[PDB]
């Protein structure tokens, strides 16, 4: 879940006020302050917006794609600026940051 919250009480909803609730439990904790949105460009042309943290593993990222799109992780390979992404590494390992684009290609074995 994501929503705007008027933290500062300007009365004017601002860009630095998009908050992201990863757990979907109604709140943002200290860890979710670092949450971000990344984009995943698929082959159907559809672009998926993902809610992630820099500590998320690529395997987690793939699990989230399945929640949203129904695609099994075994069928998923992710690419970021050339480097294909290893399941056990994190978004931070690859220096994947807010509003980065990942490419989702089709995994074929052998
Ligand atoms: Gd504000
Ligand atoms: Gd939360």
């Amino acid at each position: 879940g994501a929503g705007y919250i008027d933290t500062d009480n300007d009365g004017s909803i601002d860009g630095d006020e998009l908050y992201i609730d990863t757990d979907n439990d109604g709140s943002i904790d200290g860890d979710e302050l670092l949450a971000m949105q990344i984009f995943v460009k698929t082959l159907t042309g559809k672009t998926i917006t993902l809610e992630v943290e820099p500590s998320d593993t690529i395997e987690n990222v793939k699990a989230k794609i399945q929640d949203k799109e129904g695609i099994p992780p075994d069928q998923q390979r992710l690419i970021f600026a050339g480097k294909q992404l290893e399941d056990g590494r994190t978004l931070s390992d690859y220096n994947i940051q807010k509003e980065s684009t990942l490419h989702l290609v089709l995994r074929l074995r052998g």
Side-chain angles (χ1 to χ4, degrees):
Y4 288 85
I5 304 168
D6 194 21
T7 64
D8 84 335
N9 302 80
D10 236 27
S12 206
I13 292 296
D14 300 311
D16 61 8
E17 280 159 4
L18 206 180
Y19 292 88
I20 295 171
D21 178 8
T22 295
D23 307 25
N24 303 284
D25 57 20
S27 53
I28 313 294
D29 59 30
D31 290 321
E32 278 157 325
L33 253 32
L34 304 175
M36 39 172 52
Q37 297 186 321
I38 65 187
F39 306 109
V40 171
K41 195 171 186 294
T42 75
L43 299 163
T44 77
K46 185 169 179 24
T47 280
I48 299 160
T49 305
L50 285 186
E51 286 153 5
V52 290
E53 275 159 15
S55 80
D56 271 334
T57 49
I58 298 312
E59 191 202 2
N60 290 336
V61 166
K62 303 187 165 170
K64 295 175 188 299
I65 300 173
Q66 175 176 43
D67 299 335
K68 283 174 74 80
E69 289 299 299
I71 302 177
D74 73 45
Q75 308 180 20
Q76 306 179 17
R77 167 162 293 182
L78 295 170
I79 300 138
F80 174 64
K83 294 306 273 168
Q84 76 177 56
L85 307 177
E86 241 168 80
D87 271 7
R89 294 236 277 179
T90 64
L91 294 179
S92 172
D93 287 337
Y94 294 109
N95 182 91
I96 296 179
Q97 293 176 301
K98 48 166 43 61
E99 301 162 355
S100 280
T101 296
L102 291 190
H103 294 84
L104 172 61
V105 298
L106 250 184
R107 183 70 174 98
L108 180 71
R109 303 154 211 275

